């Protein structure tokens, strides 16, 4: 079936490659890779983060409320006698 002899039909594309032993494995990290990671974080920040911030607010609120609910109310004894 699917085999490297007849996958698709292409015309007029040229490629060039070096061998691994001719070139470096980690050529430019701090001059190219770091800024690229930075933009890659920039492009997705506001699509992911705010939902989790909202989750954090909800969690803390619900915890606080549950913990208030367990403390004794002075009006339950002071009001009528």
């Amino acid at each position: 079936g699917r085999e490297f002899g007849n996958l698709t039909r292409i015309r007029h594309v040229i490629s060039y490659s070096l061998s691994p032993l001719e070139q470096r494995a980690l050529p430019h990290v701090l001059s190219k890779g770091v800024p690229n990671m930075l933009r890659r974080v920039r492009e997705s920040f506001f699509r992911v983060v705010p939902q989790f911030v909202v989750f954090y607010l909800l969690y803390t609120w619900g915890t606080e409320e549950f913990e208030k609910s367990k403390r004794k109310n002075p009006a339950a004894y002071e009001n009528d006698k």
Partner: protein, 32 residues
């Protein structure tokens, strides 16, 4: 036709172990 062919330059990627050229080719190969 083809005769206009030329591989683009790869200078950024190549190892310094061949750029510091004071050693025969095949001995370099061996070191790498």
């Amino acid at each position: 036709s083809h005769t206009d062919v030329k591989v683009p330059d790869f200078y950024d990627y190549r190892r310094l172990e061949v750029l510091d050229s004071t050693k025969s080719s095949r001995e370099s190969s061996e070191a790498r």
